């Protein structure tokens, strides 16, 4: 079905994830429906590192989109941050 | 919301069908001259009320035959 | 550098081809296309179709030779 | 303070009983770096006499061009024999981007920022001839105002 997950861009040894809503069958870095956040695991954390349009994430869940283990974590982490 | 085309009847021979030609001017992509282009459409004319040479208003609809996806809305001018 | 496999064998002018060109038949074995040496042409020295002449032959192409000695 | 530039030197030849007589030609431009440009062309048996005759010609036979803060008023086309010429007022910082023949003319003229290009024959004597005349016929925001009989904003 439709799922919200991380498409891994960035460079070798320097991962950078683009959070995307997509048909789960399409390849990880392939066709998606909507971009909805990003996630830098290598951010200096002096400034940002994790940004989620929670309004559109929820909208898609409301219509049955599932959510990665890793995005489900980010959302709990970001909800905690503020 | 009534999208529509206007053109003239080049053939009225077929039973309940007609051939309509839509002509327009178009800027030439390279040399800038404005050129005549024509689009011929097989259109539905239930009742065959459209005569050749008539100017008619037509609309797009579902497939009616291998080549007909348009039907008549109404005649505008006739028998020049 | 300039290798040294050149030779100076002699022969006799056979044909009087075009543009200072000749059939020159080597006293040795056959004849070659033989063209007139620059020097020689610069100092003119016409060359009749039947003269004893010296040829410079590169083993690279025995088939050809340059006329060195005028007569 | 006048600026003078040697554009091209060339050897021509004249034939007589005895053989060929060789001589030289020189094409130069002088300019005041502030809107005045002349070009000269001299001939002589030796090169120095030729490069010198030309400067002499270049100093007189000089004309004025209505510059605009070191750049041109409007794009301009110039033509002379083989050479079709084209120039544009560029923004500040660019400098003169142009062929040798034109650069020398524009430099000594005081045209600080321009886009130029020569089409057809790049024969230097006719290229410069075509540039000078281009700059010369180049009219000014004030003269068009004078012409049209109005000192509107366009003044």
């Amino acid at each position: 079905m439709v799922t919200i997950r991380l498409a891994r861009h960035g460079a070798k040894k320097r991962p950078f994830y683009q959070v995307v809503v997509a048909d789960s069958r399409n390849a990880r870095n392939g066709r998606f429906i909507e971009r909805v956040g990003f996630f830098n695991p290598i951010a200096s954390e002096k400034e940002e590192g994790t940004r989620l349009d929670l309004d559109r994430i929820a909208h898609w869940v409301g219509q049955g989109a599932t959510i990665s283990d890793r995005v489900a974590a980010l959302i709990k982490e970001v909800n905690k941050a503020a | 919301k009534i999208r529509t085309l206007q053109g003239r009847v080049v053939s009225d021979k077929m039973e309940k069908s007609i051939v309509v030609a839509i002509e327009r001017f178009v800027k030439h992509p390279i040399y800038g001259k404005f050129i005549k282009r024509t689009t011929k459409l097989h259109v539905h004319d239930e009742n065959n009320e459209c005569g050749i040479g008539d100017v008619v208003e037509i609309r797009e609809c579902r497939p009616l035959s291998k080549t007909k996806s348009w039907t008549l809305v109404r005649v505008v001018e006739k028998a020049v | 550098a300039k290798e040294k496999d050149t030779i100076r064998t002699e022969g006799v002018v056979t044909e009087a081809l075009p543009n200072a060109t000749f059939r020159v038949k080597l006293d040795s074995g056959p004849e070659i296309l033989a063209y007139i040496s620059g020097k020689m042409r610069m100092h003119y020295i016409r060359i009749l179709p039947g003269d004893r002449v010296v040829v410079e032959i590169t083993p690279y192409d025995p088939t050809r030779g340059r006329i060195v000695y005028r007569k | 303070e006048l600026q003078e530039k040697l554009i091209a030197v060339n050897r021509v030849s004249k034939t007589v009983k005895g053989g060929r007589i060789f001589s030289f030609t020189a094409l130069t431009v002088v300019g005041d770096g502030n809107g005045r440009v002349g070009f000269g062309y001299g001939k002589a048996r030796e090169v120095p006499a030729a490069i010198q005759k030309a400067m002499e010609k270049a100093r007189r036979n000089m004309i004025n061009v209505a510059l605009n803060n070191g750049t041109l008023q409007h794009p301009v086309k110039g033509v002379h024999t083989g050479s079709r010429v084209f120039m544009q007022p560029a923004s500040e910082g660019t400098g003169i981007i142009a062929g040798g023949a034109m650069r020398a003319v524009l430099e000594v003229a005081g045209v600080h920022n321009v886009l130029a290009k020569a089409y057809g024959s790049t024969n230097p004597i006719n290229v410069v001839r075509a540039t000078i005349d281009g700059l010369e016929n180049m009219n000014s925001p004030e003269m068009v105002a004078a012409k049209r009989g109005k000192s509107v904003e366009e003044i």
Binding site: - | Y31, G32, K33 | - | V144, R148, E154
Partner: protein
């Protein structure tokens, strides 16, 4: 035949001007009269008149300055063989604004400057400097 009378108008101006003529005259037309209006209003000619009713002859009084013609160049742009239309944001300007382009709009004939300021595009009739 006489298939572009506007080029004809441009040219009669250009040639009489080159010939240091005091005036030029041509068969009239609203469209010519609309262009003559712009020329006069922008100071490229003195004045103009149309005379007669059934076969109107239009007359343009030319203009000279330093024993020079005020009109330096005058060229047809759009033409029967190649119509040229521009949008408001595409309107050419002649001599970096020193000259003018005559433009025909839904609101009648005016200069590039005018049409620009009035948010319009149109058929580019000619350039004048």
């Amino acid at each position: 035949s006489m298939q572009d009378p506007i080029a004809d108008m441009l040219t009669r101006i250009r040639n009489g001007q080159a010939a240091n003529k005091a005036a030029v005259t041509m068969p009239s037309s609203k469209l010519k009269v609309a262009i003559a209006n712009v020329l006069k209003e922008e100071g490229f000619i003195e004045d103009f008149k149309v005379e007669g009713d059934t076969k109107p002859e239009l007359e343009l009084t030319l203009k000279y300055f330093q024993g020079k013609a005020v009109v330096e160049s005058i060229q047809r742009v759009s033409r029967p063989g190649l119509r040229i239309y521009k949008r408001k944001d595409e309107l050419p300007k002649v001599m970096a604004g020193l000259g003018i382009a005559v433009v025909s709009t839904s609101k009648g004939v005016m200069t590039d400057r005018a049409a620009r300021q009035a948010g319009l595009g149109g058929e580019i009739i000619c350039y004048v400097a």
